[PDB]
Design a protein around this ligand. Structure first.
Ligand SMILES: [Zn+2]
Lengths: 202, 202
């Protein structure tokens, strides 16, 4: 109970030791000047488990977090929070491999869904925002702009089942605005969509 | 241990009682002439649990089977095996609602996948065989003939993303043979496919 069993260089916790915390946490790893630095394992009382780098009593560098619910993070940390390039395996099978800033997907990364769908592009605030490509499980592909996990802006949808390529505007994950359908017989249709429904042909 | 605690009409297990079996099973329900008939609950030693009808020491009629792995069957039984109209909830979320013959899907039924896809049609030997409709999660729809869970024969595929309707031959779940693509601009393409790939246009 808030004890320490390790080396005591110059009367300060330095080297390698074990520390049990008042809230129930336990740390076993390297120490400098009473700080948690180097490498070590922290066992949370809630069942979470961390193994990786430490700087100034905080996760800094590469480390892994084994969560209770089954998730696992493998990546870099800054000031005790997910930060930088890291991989996160979700409970059901989904996996994100990309950049993080302050414990949220921000930057370029890819999500491998357990359904077979694969996204890779730019993330802003834990959601798809900006340019990205979604490779659907059926072979369909969307490449274009995203806003808050919705196909939003202009993108190109190519259908694997019949080869038809849509090129035009999207709003809230649906075809909306000016666009063109190009079929495999060379013919190109121009039209106006409203919430994914073609309503006007030119 | 192979005891009996129930009514004993005319020196035979009749009425309602409890029977513990030598392999570990336990039955609690109605009895006629030493037989398990009427209704009752059988607790298997492996953790399986049955509640429903019984005729002549066997599941006959409607009853439910709570499996260990998480599955659950709700339907009719004949001679201790799944038989007739019944519903089966799979571990991950999938559910079959249809006909069974000898513990296997045989007849007309529908499977509600946890992915959102819904099939409904004829089943032969636990697989799709014959006419059936597959309503995909993306809005796509296939209606045609199936062989061993594969689109096989002639069917009609309609694509929700661009409206293109394919009508032609399928072999081993892929477009193969004579077929026609009908686009939303009225134009109809005739061609020959090879394993889902259009290779010849007429
Ligand atoms: Zn299509």
């Amino acid at each position: 109970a808030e004890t320490y069993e390790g080396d005591w260089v110059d009367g300060k916790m330095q080297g390698r030791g074990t520390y049990f915390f008042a809230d129930g946490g336990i740390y076993e790893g390297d120490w400098v000047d009473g700080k948690m630095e180097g490498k070590g394992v922290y066992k949370y009382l809630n069942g979470n488990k961390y193994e990786g780098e430490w700087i100034n009593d905080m996760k800094n560098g590469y480390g892994t977090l084994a969560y209770v619910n089954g998730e696992l993070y493998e990546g870099y940390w800054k000031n005790d929070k997910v930060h930088g390039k890291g991989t996160l395996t979700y409970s059901k099978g989904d996996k994100y491999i990309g950049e993080w800033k302050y414990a949220k997907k921000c930057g370029e990364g890819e999500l491998i869904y357990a359904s077979g769908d694969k996204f890779k592009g730019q993330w802003k605030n834990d959601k798809a925002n900006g340019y990205g490509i979604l490779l659907y499980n059926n072979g369909n592909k969307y490449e274009g702009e995203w806003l808050d996990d919705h196909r939003h802006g202009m993108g190109t949808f190519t259908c694997k089942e019949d080869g038809t390529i849509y090129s035009g505007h999207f709003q809230f994950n649906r075809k909306h605005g000016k666009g063109t359908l190009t079929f495999v017989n060379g013919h190109i249709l121009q039209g106006i969509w409203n919430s994914g429904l073609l309503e006007k042909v030119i």
